[PDB]
């Protein structure tokens, strides 16, 4: 045994470099910290499938909707045969429908036969307890909780000729005390809201609650999470909430409030490990592996590791690993908000000696987020693990074997409308473009045969003259309209405004059209220093803008050639805002509106200061 304890608590957070030296002079690891050392552990999925089928809150009175663990029935309490893995889950409309073999993975059976008992209430919890290794068997019964009742079932003597799973029953014992019950455990032992009782299970399915019970009722706890488990078999139950753990012995008269977690934490989940002594507790901010005590099995709180993720809906599953010199305990926490996982690898040695390794995480399937994750007992440093999930907004049950070695409904159910007169008239535009695309490929192909001709050169000669008349008219249209103190088209022509096909040759026109003007009232904005928001980089020429756009649509189009010409030309029909007046136009209005405000507004209208 090491050195680190306190008698009530025992801590080892992430990379604290914990407090357990001893200085052993044995010349092989002269320190016995609460940490191991080895190589990595990367996790890869082995994906399979098993079965299928206000808004800002969640009701904590639900616990599970599925369970699956190895069973040993009466015929397996008689014969050599030991072990058949089953599944107990829910399906249907509101989850009120209640209903195998391992080839290499877990799979539903060949005879596709489930046991459909009809239930008249929504299902809140489905579990089978599992038995202890001091009773030698694996329990054949199953306890579930509905919204309106509390029903206990039992599997009895399944077949192999048709894989028939049949059920006996206990009756639905309705709420004679009219309060909703929260979490059951067997290991009719029940936890109602605030109070509890110990029940008696009958072997008689041919036609109950004892006079020993109690309560933990906290008047200053406003949620309704409650939780009971048998602890160390000596008739000791552990009754929880999101505030505290009470240890209650229901055989003697001896109650103890052990844990009290109101200050800066709560209690999120408490999974009872199938081991008789070692059991984990998940709180927020910390993962606790508080086991039982060696001398007197009451409670002994052991080494724990802190947990950074914070949420109100955190749970845990925990799967053992048996190895010769030690026992691992992986710890998968999960939530209802995200798809992520968080795992930690503890270790149990022979002298109740605990250690730690570290933490990792994996990814999942993008339809919703998980709500419950269940591991496989698997009937018994190249680690392996197996489990199965169930996501929210879904009802499929996948399968995973982790080892050391997005379509939204509103984007889909909004279109494709089902009328008769409106069945092909939406495609009238589809027939319209086929009337225009076949047109506008022949209208351009007039100009494509025109290459360095005189027959296309005379268009631009008329183009430099048809813009030149109405623009000097427009220049003097702004001097007559200058006494205003109160605009750009480049569609003044009406010939085609499409009848020339060259990227370098129109730049010879427009730059000569730029060398046309030198007087006032005419100003042209840049194009070789202002186009560049599309390539997001240098555009040294308007011609070499097209160059990499020619290197862009080679494989994706028929002939790939003239469309990239005409869109670059259409930017010249769209980006060319070239009718800004000269400096008399801002200056006559940068002082006139400066006069509409007084001297208070003058100095508070100020630039050119930094």
């Amino acid at each position: 045994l090491g050195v680190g304890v306190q008698g009530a608590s025992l801590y080892c957070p992430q990379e604290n470099y914990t407090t357990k030296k001893q200085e052993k002079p044995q010349w092989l690891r002269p320190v016995d910290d609460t940490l191991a050392e080895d190589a990595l552990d990367l996790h890869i999925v082995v994906k399979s499938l098993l079965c299928d089928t206000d808004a800002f809150f969640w009701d904590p009175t639900v616990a599970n909707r599925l369970d699956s663990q190895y069973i040993q029935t009466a015929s397996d309490l008689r014969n050599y045969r030991d072990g058949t893995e089953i599944i107990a889950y829910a399906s249907g409309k509101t989850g009120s429908v209640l209903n195998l073999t391992r080839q290499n993975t877990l799979h539903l059976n060949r005879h596709n036969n489930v046991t459909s008992i009809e239930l008249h209430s929504p299902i809140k919890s489905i579990k089978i307890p599992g038995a202890s290794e001091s009773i030698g068997r694996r329990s054949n019964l199953v306890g579930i909780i509905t919204e309106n009742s509390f029903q206990i079932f039992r599997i009895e003597s399944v077949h192999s000729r048709s894989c028939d799973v049949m059920v006996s029953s206990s009756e639905p014992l309705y709420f004679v005390e009219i309060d909703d019950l929260q979490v059951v455990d067997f290991a009719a032992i029940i936890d109602i809201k605030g109070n509890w009782s110990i029940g008696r299970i009958p072997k008689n399915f041919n036609n109950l609650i004892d006079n020993l019970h109690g309560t933990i009722f906290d008047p200053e706890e406003l949620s309704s999470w409650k939780r009971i488990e048998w602890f160390s078999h000596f008739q000791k139950i552990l009754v929880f909430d999101r505030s505290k753990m009470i240890e209650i012995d229901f055989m003697n008269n001896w109650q103890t409030e052990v844990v009290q977690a109101k200050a800066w934490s709560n209690i999120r989940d408490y999974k009872r490990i199938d081991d008789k002594n070692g059991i984990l507790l998940t709180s927020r901010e910390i993962i606790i592996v508080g086991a039982s005590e060696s001398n007197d099995p009451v409670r002994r709180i052991s080494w724990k590791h802190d947990l950074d993720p914070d949420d109100t809906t955190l749970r845990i599953t925990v799967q053992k690993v048996k190895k010769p010199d030690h026992i691992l305990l992986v710890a998968f926490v999960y939530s209802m908000r995200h798809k992520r996982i968080y795992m930690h690898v503890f270790s149990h040695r022979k002298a109740n000696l605990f250690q730690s390794l570290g933490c990792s995480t994996v990814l999942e399937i993008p339809g919703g987020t998980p709500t419950g994750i269940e591991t496989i007992l698997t009937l018994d440093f190249e680690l392996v693990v197996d489990f199965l999930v169930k996501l929210r907004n879904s009802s499929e049950v996948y399968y995973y074997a982790l080892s050391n070695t997005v379509d939204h409904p509103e984007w889909a159910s909004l279109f494709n409308n089902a009328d008769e007169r409106e069945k092909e008239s939406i495609g009238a535009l589809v027939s319209q473009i086929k009337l225009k695309e076949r047109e506008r490929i022949s209208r351009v192909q007039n100009l494509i045969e025109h290459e360095n001709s005189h027959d296309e050169d005379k268009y631009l000669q008329d183009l430099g003259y048809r813009l030149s008349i109405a623009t000097n008219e427009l220049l003097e249209s702004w001097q007559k309209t200058k006494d205003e103190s109160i605009h750009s088209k480049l569609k003044n022509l009406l010939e085609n405004s499409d009848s020339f096909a060259s990227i370098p040759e129109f730049s010879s026109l427009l730059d000569q059209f730029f060398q046309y003007y030198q007087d006032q009232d005419v100003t042209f904005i840049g194009f070789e220093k202002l186009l560049h928001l599309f390539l997001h980089e240098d555009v040294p020429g308007l011609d070499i803008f097209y160059n990499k756009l020619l290197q862009c649509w080679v494989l994706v189009s028929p002939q790939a050639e003239l469309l990239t010409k005409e869109i670059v030309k259409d930017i010249i029909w769209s980006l060319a805002r070239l009718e800004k007046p000269s400096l008399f136009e801002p200056i006559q209005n940068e002082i006139s509106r400066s006069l509409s405000g007084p001297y208070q507004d003058i100095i508070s209208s100020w630039d050119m200061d930094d």
Binding site: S9, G194, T215, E220, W264, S283
Partner: protein, 330 residues
Amino acid sequence: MFEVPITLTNRKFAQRRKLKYQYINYISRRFDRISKKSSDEERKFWKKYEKPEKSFEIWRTVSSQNKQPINKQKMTYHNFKKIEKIPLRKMEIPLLHCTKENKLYFQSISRGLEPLKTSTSEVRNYRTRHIVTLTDLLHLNVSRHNWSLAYKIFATLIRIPGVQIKSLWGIGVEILDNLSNSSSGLDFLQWMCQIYSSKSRFVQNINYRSIVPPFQTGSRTHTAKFAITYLWSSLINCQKSMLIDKISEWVLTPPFMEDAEVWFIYASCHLLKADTLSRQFVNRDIKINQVIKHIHYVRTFLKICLDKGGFAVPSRLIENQLKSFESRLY
């Protein structure tokens, strides 16, 4: 997902704690006047309690005079029906000053229904928004065993104004697990216990937000988690250069006269001396009666570890270690 070191404060989460802790008090003061016959509203509620300040949870061990009898007085519907009406009917006047979702949040948490919208989501600040991005990738790359990238995230995270002690010292394995061009990691723990170490009393009446005792502060009767970390990691490193006198003098200077875990390591300094010095390489005047101090310092400093509160040591095994040191003393 992870915990974010932000002092994020919204009035919506501040009124709904000013709304709930008001409702806890009237229904607990109601339970006072039924069990006998059978102003801030949050500073009043915590006066019942005692915050742990050494632990996240006040662990009350069972094998003591903390035993209790079972109240078999269970709660039925007819006790639960009128103990909650008149505190709900007495809550009715501030429930219109609150927002339209706070009253809906309240009647949700009047009947259980633990919420689902966490405060880390809807802040929309652009400065806390890059905090929450950088904290998760910080915890991811340390988890993903990636150290050059996590050292770059953590150098960027600490330079944003608003961050806390939370990210600072816990994941400072990034210097401890680098060890290539390192600052050795122990100079940063020296940075922690030189500026944050204060011996103030834990005043417990003010409502603590964004600084929490058990893992980032260092008051009286609570040695800091980073202070005792700088004790153990500078004794394991002190072995692994084979300076023990440099720390045996250094531990001697604080009288941490409450806790017992610093007295074991102050015994464990001399226990490493009495293991290293007791070699002598002969096959004899001062080296024999110098170790006779170091055996006597381990024996008296282990007793004062037992004299203080709960911290058990294997003092049966240590005397098997110390007598094996004596076998070369003779």
